[PDB]
Structure 1
């Protein structure tokens, strides 16, 4: 069957999880790109074995998890090694993603993709929702949540797509500058709208 896909994105500290949890509480199957990626390389995972074999024993930590910074260093300024890693991980991630879409029982799925803009993954969504906040909010929340410096987060902000680049691809925008309950009004309206879109989309003659 065809499933309706609403993709959710937002920059660091925008409160992506908060909004996705609000939809999850309404019975929507959330498909989380970062959760999937972490599971693909979890201890005893086949791909983690392949990583260790190709790159070295230095790739696996004491506790058995992937040493992400060491792997990063390994592919730095090396397109062939970066290509090798992607050729291993991308199809496993794609497969698990499609699998979860297919196994979803909710009327639409919420696909949470931090890199939606950067990887052009909006092309694979029926609807795009952006959780939006000020860069100030992104800095403060990140500084506080992960106990890190302002300059540290500022560097992360400089590496992700801009706030404007996300808004350029958005169908819907939810402001998340305040407390978690402040999103409830938008979430209720968007959910009711998405359920309607999902119920009509396969046979809908005229778009929008």
Structure 2
């Protein structure tokens, strides 16, 4: 078995910065967003199911998914969102499980943007939340995208609140910094996680 530490945070919290810091210590990172992309790659069962359901025009000349087309085709039929999700849900679960089993690091870091929203913390052994102020989320996202404060605040309104995330966190790491202290903070967490992972299979009492 593999010890699973789930990492989550809101838009603009810099989850990648924290994940890369754990990757630097030899931890394998399994990213929910990458897995979702991997399950619709050429050859994947989901791709054929998608073409069969939405039609051949969802497939590009090279056989890959026309994501933009499908993305806009869903918006034009939210009911379709459900069929798609019901299709991909099982596949993402199986591919995620596969990649976790394949990781050889002491424990794995599973990055899940929607950890709180979809209650996926129930599938984690430990929950780490990358925390930052709402201003930081707004600032960074804008500087990385567009439409000033609006648009983004529309995103923050659609995600779980800062407080909702802290409510389910076992550990919290601040990323308002530079990250001047992320390397240090990550090192401390790593030490604890190595300990938790080496004893979790046989530990008789919590």
Q: Is the 8 A contact 1:142 1:148 kept in 2?
A: no
Deviation of 1:63 (Å):
7.0
Please report how far the alpha carbon of residue 92 of structure 1 lies from its aligned counterpart in structure 2 after TM superposition.
1.4
Deviations along 1:133-172, whole A, 9 cap, x unmatched?
1111111111112344321211111111111111110000
Determine the C-alpha separation between the residues in 1 that align with 2:202 and 2:157: 42
**1:194 deviation in Å?**
0.2
The answer to whether structure 1 residue 175 and structure 2 residue 166 are counterparts is no
After TM superposition, the structure 1 stretch with the greater mean CA deviation from structure 2, 120-129 or 195-204, is 195-204
**Runs (5+) with no aligned partner, structure 2:** none
Q: For structure 1, which runs of at least 5 residues remain unmatched after alignment?
A: none
Q: Alpha-carbon deviation of 1:49?
A: 3.0
Distance 2:80 2:200 in 1: 42
- Runs of 4 or more off by more than 2 Å in structure 1? 42-46, 56-84, 146-150
Q: Which residue of 1 aligns with 2:40?
A: 41
- The reply to whether residue 81 of structure 1 matches residue 65 of structure 2 is no
Partner Cα distance (1:59, 1:35) in 2: 20
- 1:60/1:152 Cα in 2 relative to 1: closer, same or farther (>3 Å)? farther
Secondary structure class of the residue paired with 1:129: strand
Taking structure 1 as reference, are residues 69 and 155 closer, same or farther at Cα in structure 2, changes over 3 Å only? Answer: farther
Deviations 1:43-88 (A, max 9, x none): 5544223212211244345776544454345445867533321232
Judge conservation of contact 1:9–1:113 (CA < 8 Å) in 2.
yes
Instruction: Give the alignment's Cα RMSD to 1 decimal.
Output: 2.1
Aligned length: 206
Aligned partners of 1:12, 1:30: CA distance in 2, in Å?
19
- Any conservation in 2 of the 1:7–1:113 contact (CA below 8 Å)? yes
TM-score (norm. length: structure 1): 0.89
Distance 1:143 1:79 in 2: 27
Task: Return the alpha-carbon distance in structure 2 between the equivalents of residues 110 and 88 of structure 1.
Answer: 25
1:205–1:181 distance in 2 versus 1, CA, 3 Å: same
Q: Is the 8 A contact 1:142 1:153 kept in 2?
A: yes
Secondary structure of 2:30's counterpart equals strand
1:110 matched residue in structure 2: 109
TM-score (norm 2): 0.90
